[PDB]
Amino acid sequence: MDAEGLALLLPPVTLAALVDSWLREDCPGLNYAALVSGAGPSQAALWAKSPGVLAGQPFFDAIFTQLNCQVSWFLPEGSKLVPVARVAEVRGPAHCLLLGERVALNTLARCSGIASAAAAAVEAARGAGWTGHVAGTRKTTPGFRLVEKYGLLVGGAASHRYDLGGLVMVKDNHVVAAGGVEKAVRAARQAADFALKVEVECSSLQEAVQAAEAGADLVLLDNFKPEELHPTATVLKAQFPSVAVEASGGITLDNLPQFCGPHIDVISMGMLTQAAPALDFSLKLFAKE
Amino acid sequence: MDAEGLALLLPPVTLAALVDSWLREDCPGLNYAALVSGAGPSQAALWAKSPGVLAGQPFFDAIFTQLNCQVSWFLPEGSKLVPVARVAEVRGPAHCLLLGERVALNTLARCSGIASAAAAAVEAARGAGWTGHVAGTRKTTPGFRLVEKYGLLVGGAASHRYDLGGLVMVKDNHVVAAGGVEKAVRAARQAADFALKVEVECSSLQEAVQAAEAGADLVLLDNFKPEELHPTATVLKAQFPSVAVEASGGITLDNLPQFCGPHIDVISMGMLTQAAPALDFSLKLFAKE
Amino acid sequence: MDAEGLALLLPPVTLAALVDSWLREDCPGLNYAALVSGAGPSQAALWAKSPGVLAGQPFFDAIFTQLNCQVSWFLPEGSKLVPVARVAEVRGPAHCLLLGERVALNTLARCSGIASAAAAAVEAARGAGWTGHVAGTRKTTPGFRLVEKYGLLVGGAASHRYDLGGLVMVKDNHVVAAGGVEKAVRAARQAADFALKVEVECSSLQEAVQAAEAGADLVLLDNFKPEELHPTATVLKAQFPSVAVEASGGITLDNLPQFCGPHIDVISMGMLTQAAPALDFSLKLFAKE
Amino acid sequence: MDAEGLALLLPPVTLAALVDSWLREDCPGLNYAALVSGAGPSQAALWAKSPGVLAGQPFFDAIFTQLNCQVSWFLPEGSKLVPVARVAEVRGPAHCLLLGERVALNTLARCSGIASAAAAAVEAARGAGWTGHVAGTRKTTPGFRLVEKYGLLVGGAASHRYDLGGLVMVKDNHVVAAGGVEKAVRAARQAADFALKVEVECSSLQEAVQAAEAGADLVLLDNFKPEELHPTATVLKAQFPSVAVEASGGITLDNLPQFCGPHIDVISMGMLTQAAPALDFSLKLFAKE
Amino acid sequence: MDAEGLALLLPPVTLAALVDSWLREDCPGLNYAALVSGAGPSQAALWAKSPGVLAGQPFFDAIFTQLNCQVSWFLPEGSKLVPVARVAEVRGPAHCLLLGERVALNTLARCSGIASAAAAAVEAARGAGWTGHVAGTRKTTPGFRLVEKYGLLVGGAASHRYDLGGLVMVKDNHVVAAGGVEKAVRAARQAADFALKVEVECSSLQEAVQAAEAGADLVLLDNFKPEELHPTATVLKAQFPSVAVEASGGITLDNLPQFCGPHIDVISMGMLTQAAPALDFSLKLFAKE
Amino acid sequence: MDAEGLALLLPPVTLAALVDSWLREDCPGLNYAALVSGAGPSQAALWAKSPGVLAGQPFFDAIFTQLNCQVSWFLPEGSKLVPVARVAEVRGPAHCLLLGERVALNTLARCSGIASAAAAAVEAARGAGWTGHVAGTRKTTPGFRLVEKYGLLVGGAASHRYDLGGLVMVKDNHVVAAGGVEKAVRAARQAADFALKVEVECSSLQEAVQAAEAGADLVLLDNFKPEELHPTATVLKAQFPSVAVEASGGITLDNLPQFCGPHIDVISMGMLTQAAPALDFSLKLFAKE
Ligand SMILES: O=C(O)c1cccnc1C(=O)O
Ligand SMILES: O=C(O)c1cccnc1C(=O)O
Ligand SMILES: O=C(O)c1cccnc1C(=O)O
Ligand SMILES: O=C(O)c1cccnc1C(=O)O
Ligand SMILES: O=C(O)c1cccnc1C(=O)O
Ligand SMILES: O=C(O)c1cccnc1C(=O)O
């Protein structure tokens, strides 16, 4: 995509409600440190001290806008961060900058760190000649989904489904509960009348074929070794060429290339959200003359 | 210090609210996946697949209570996870179990992941002879502070001030805006009447002394090499024996012992929250009764 | 669709919150008519005074639950209503029973009113030997969508996309804004990726082909006369067998049979929500043994 | 009355909140369709496609304001709508115009639908030479009451009580629970100390006299056939000239002239909110010259 | 009446919501104090240390119910408090009792203090032979109206009009805005269609008469000396026998009998809410024997 | 203090939330009174009818801002009010001023009442040559703590800790629950890692010392007569120089000077918030073309 146009995804109602809560979480009562700085007009520089990808400007902006501060970016959303970079400047009343400071920073650090891993992982795949979509999961922080999924998009990963209402994903537990894969997929297909796709976690070739026969649009190959994964995917694409194939389970940055192959459409990774460290940013006030 | 007594810190109102919003994030509309599993009474086993410390039972319990499911814990809050362990059992209607599965796991993974890092770091400190307090920061995920600060406790580090509303904290930025460290602290110390303490970030011996003279209860030595840090702290404690010394900036699990000396009372670490990977948990239905 | 299992689609959090907002709407302050009834143990009987389909038990139930009342139903959810029928008995404190009454009845009235129309539309389509799906739209009352979309399902219609983060729908205005049907569907598919279906509104056969060619999952044939619809449908189906066709616009109970064909998969009708008179119900306290 | 000044009744806080819940209902997560339109400065025409009364302007406006879009109206609120008329022009970014489209349309459709049905009933009553008040009920869609009551006022009906903290209304059930009309009215008058009126639903002449005697500000005649209603009213009016008489139950636009008569003061009709079809409108983007 | 049956006025939704804000206000973060008491099953005695009237049981209860505690009342709601009285007893986990303490005490203290003041006023009114209704105002604490108005009622005063939603009160300002008293009342009367009473603030016998002629249901005689009030009110009743006559403005508990007279129906008092000191209660843990 | 620079303490999100709830409480539905005044541009004078200290401008401003109304203050926050003052002017639509009026007046009155009470007290203390802190308590009206604690500051008192997660307070009850003072304070000390202070309620010199020995930062001497208080305090300060001493319990404005001795640091007064009458203010519409 283009990372600058991604911001248009964020609906501005649910956005400001997020921002409000984040501020309240941090300053529920009186802001005593306000008195230290006073409210004089001020400027601070946003320092990027970690390599990766910048993401999260829409969140960073919104937070400060709520506090009557203005942000000037010196890079675009999505651009590569080359450490000790001065990536932006923030102007407003001192106390307002310093109240927004930590929250904006945390939001930007986390969003960026996710985008960073996603870009790293996308590269590694491109590098192995893979043409598919590296994806995320629902293994997001609670109440932080919007920021994390958006982060994955800025990094060039696909978001995967956002909600639980958005694609019907039959998993091991759904199959156990429904008493077998055929039964499960039949129900799943009925519930997704014509508007929603069905995906089915399958731990074996058999489970997959059963799923694919039953009319699954996607078959997720969960926890296969690579040497098992590709022959299994080959059989599937051969027999059901219109069915998409996702590999997930245990997949990391280091090993990702082994999971890439001509018959895998999607690779999903817990790690992009669950084990992607936050980038180091600071926001420092500089004096005017 | 009992880690099972820690759930009492959680006020039940802010807890049940948080849980609602987590579930609403994940499934705002219709849960089509309820139709695949139906609603038969079922049981699921919680499996820990990562080493660390188990943290977040109160949140796990709340999530599932909200969905009319019950939880039996086989290990106490804060115990070591020795992997491929069966840590607990969850009971309830199938569709209800599966609705809360991900959000619960996410929450538990995230909280446990932090506890583990805190525990690692506390152990490191103990191992380097040091009886001070290892601590968190305000570098927490937005909307998720309660879980992360609670996690820090369960792992046995200190939370630090929760929310900018406890302790008053003067930083590089407050000093710049106030036109001096002398001015900044006097203002800070006026604001925090008797109820609140004043801590000051300082980047030199000089700036520390000025702070302590000015009436600082705590003096944070920001971003020192340990070779500078300890001589500095030695003088401070000589000249102002009742002023506490915190050290912060660049402190990893790797180098933490280097910042563990006899005149350092608090060590705060960004990494305990920012860069602690989540633990791997799963929740698998079984068909006993 | 077994209509009694549909209640499993209702996540219990968003439900309970919605119930709260309805009761607060109807009684923001003090309930003065509490004093008129007092709080004597009491029982009322719900009478269905209109013909159609009973829908809304979950909502009815959950309103009374919030006011310590209990409901016992004598008809199953989705059953046929033959007038002057006793469908349930609600038991609880008089004042509570009387507080919930209008809100609970108003909820059951539209939900049933909508289901009734859906059932009638489905019946006319089965009646013209159509094996397709009758569907709702996003033409729903603001804030009431959960009840209305559930209503359609209980009457045997498809809900279409609930959401707008569900299926990606390119409409007449999108096509304009984009700058052409070709350029728009390219951009839709890219946003949709593997996770979502792209549906496109099309005013002619030419626009439909352009669309199918750009990779549309569903072509929606907007405001065609029946004489023009079916030729156009037959063409798309011969040339792109894997694309689903939707007819929509101007469709009524009376004319629906003329829109049924062997090459229409979905027919959506705005009237099913926008013009479905609410059923007559009432709740009258009786005396007990 | 002036229909344009009714907007003053709408307190801008409850209006804005209401709008946000509607917006959030339609797009809880990510707006994928933003990418198809993009953010081009754009303009749309509001086409009125059904006959009736225009109502809902202040809500329509509020919605788009919340998305940074400006509305310009060509008909004033309350004017007669003559089909295929251009009533307004909405401008702003393309993605925003399309985000608010369906919600704003759905709001205006239903408010106008009601206004029309009220105006229609007001007209037939005027046509019978009746000078009383046609009225709404509390039979409103849950959560949508502010819009529906307002629609009644624009069509020139009277909203009954909005609220329930409103007028005190003693109904058949209140009378049953109390054990007797005179008891009930005593209790109701006590609760309505001097600030509220007391109304009593009465199913006979005998009960209506009991209630009038006991001091009710109004007597509602609950299901009378018209041949019975007017003698019962006449007797009431002669015996208690300062009591007001409401006729309710079964009153359709077709039979309304028969319920009009010199001794009825208020005629409340459930149909106005429960069975008023919504109007047809559409919002189509045009390019400028 | 019966102060015990007043609790039925409080709808359980808006209670629990109110109680939740109050608790959140007091402990928005982690409750560190809970670790000092631990969770031992405990009991505590509520001690009334001031003279007055007890009011606020429903709130006190709700608060502790939310914290899983239970309350046994030794005196009924509305009874006379003779100091150092042991009025109730509260049981539940120690940290829960202690978390609820202050918030519940503050609530009961203020409700009780208002009911005391209202009683005092109702007494003096009765003592002076007057059969009217002492009333309060909209001079309530912001967001504490439910409790304050409830207190008035328990004290035996009237809750003058709760919300601005059910009576229509024309004031000095409304008249100025409207450009005269005739105009204002005329307008008000048309706004309050048949459901709502109109009250008019009048500062002179003229302005009162004018309002009465225009159709005012009540005439409020504002800031009159008593020697002016009673002649003014006698003319009023002479000409307008069915128009209620309220007196207001600087009426204190001391002079209240001077404002009592056969022609005054209602007496509102700012002081019942604005200057009613809180009672002194305390909650003391004891060991069981 | 500098009373004008105190507004900076008020975070703008929590402020605008609070203000919305006040407005929603006072007019949840339709504002019939808007029709009486119309929307004409108007102005209103704010009159101060009582002596005291002016407090609550930020809340006042925010309230009106929310209703598109501007305020011009002719007196700085916290100035002395000398009665019949014209302290400010409010411009806006007529219906908007009148909707805001009472809510804002109510806020300003109780904020100003408290500031006044506190100024009275701080004055007597400064008059008694005392250099310590006059403080508040947590005996604040529920849901209104921000306004009341802010008012205390403006009048020159200290807020004290605001909520239960500032300083950690051990009271009679915490001691009972812990089974002793030693145990309770150790637990509070362990809980208050380094971020917080521990304060202990003590009813005797011995208990004060046990607390001081166990590491208490402050010792609150509850309910001592002045004759006991000072000699107790003189001993503490001798034997534990850096422990602070707060007196509290029964300290009226009248007797306060008796509590102002050289070994007392803090004096807390329940009365400042529990028994401080609100000041008298009106807002009157005046003329302009
Ligand atoms: O549920 C998902 O959306 C999902 C998609 C791909 C891989 N894992 C998951 C998961 O959360 O378990
Ligand atoms: O603000 C804090 O509480 C804090 C405390 C210790 C270390 N870092 C921080 C920070 O957020 O920068
Ligand atoms: O958007 C939809 O879901 C939809 C689907 C089919 C027909 N109309 C609509 C509409 O709301 O206009
Ligand atoms: O209650 C009302 O407001 C009302 C007013 C007139 C007629 N019916 C009703 C009703 O809801 O039953
Ligand atoms: O507002 C009221 O209803 C009211 C009623 C009686 C006395 N004062 C008032 C007031 O203006 O606050
Ligand atoms: O608890 C407090 O914060 C407090 C502090 C000082 C004086 N009183 C109190 C109280 O409300 O009991």
Author numbering:
A (entry chain H), B (entry chain I), C (entry chain C), D (entry chain D), E (entry chain G), F (entry chain A): 1 to 289
How did the manuscript describe this experimental structure?
QPRTs have been shown to exist as dimers or hexamers2223242526272829. HsQPRT is regulated by the interaction between two dimeric subunits. which can adopt open and closed states.
complex with QA or NAMN as a reactant or product. First, loops L and O of HsQPRT were closed upon QA binding. chain of H160 in addition to its interaction with the carboxylate moiety of QA. moiety of QA and tartrate molecules of 2.4 Å. relevance of HsQPRT-QA compared with tartrate as a QA mimic. can occupy the active site before PRPP enters. PRPP bound to the carboxylate moiety of QA to produce NAMN.
